[PDB]
Design a protein around this ligand. Structure first.
Ligand code: CU1
Length: 102
């Protein structure tokens, strides 16, 4: 799957903000526009350790941004379920999305 992170106009949005993948299918998040963004998965209170580890590995560090230099990031989630992700700098600006893994 592919997700666009941001746009050329400066909106704090993922495009699309909902995607469905098959287990093992990578999601490639690629920056669009000049505004830096990142992507980090929410880890539910509740999630088993294996799922928490998957989600951490599928997340950028909060000290990391996509740029024209490093334009993309690839996330792989094996556990079927629905997951929410967000952008660290624009988290409060409601820059978020969902991933369903079949
Ligand atoms: Cu952002």
């Amino acid at each position: 799957a592919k997700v666009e992170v941001g746009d050329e106009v400066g909106n704090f949005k993922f495009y699309p903000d909902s995607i469905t993948v098959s287990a093992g299918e990578a999601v490639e998040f690629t920056l669009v526009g000049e505004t830096p963004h990142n992507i980090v998965f929410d880890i539910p209170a509740g999630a088993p350790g294996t799922v928490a580890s998957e989600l951490k590995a599928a997340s950028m560090d909060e000290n990391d941004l996509l740029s024209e230099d490093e334009p993309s990031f690839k996330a792989k989630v094996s556990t079927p379920g629905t997951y929410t992700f967000y952008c660290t700098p624009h988290k409060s600006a409601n820059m978020k999305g969902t991933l369903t893994v079949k």
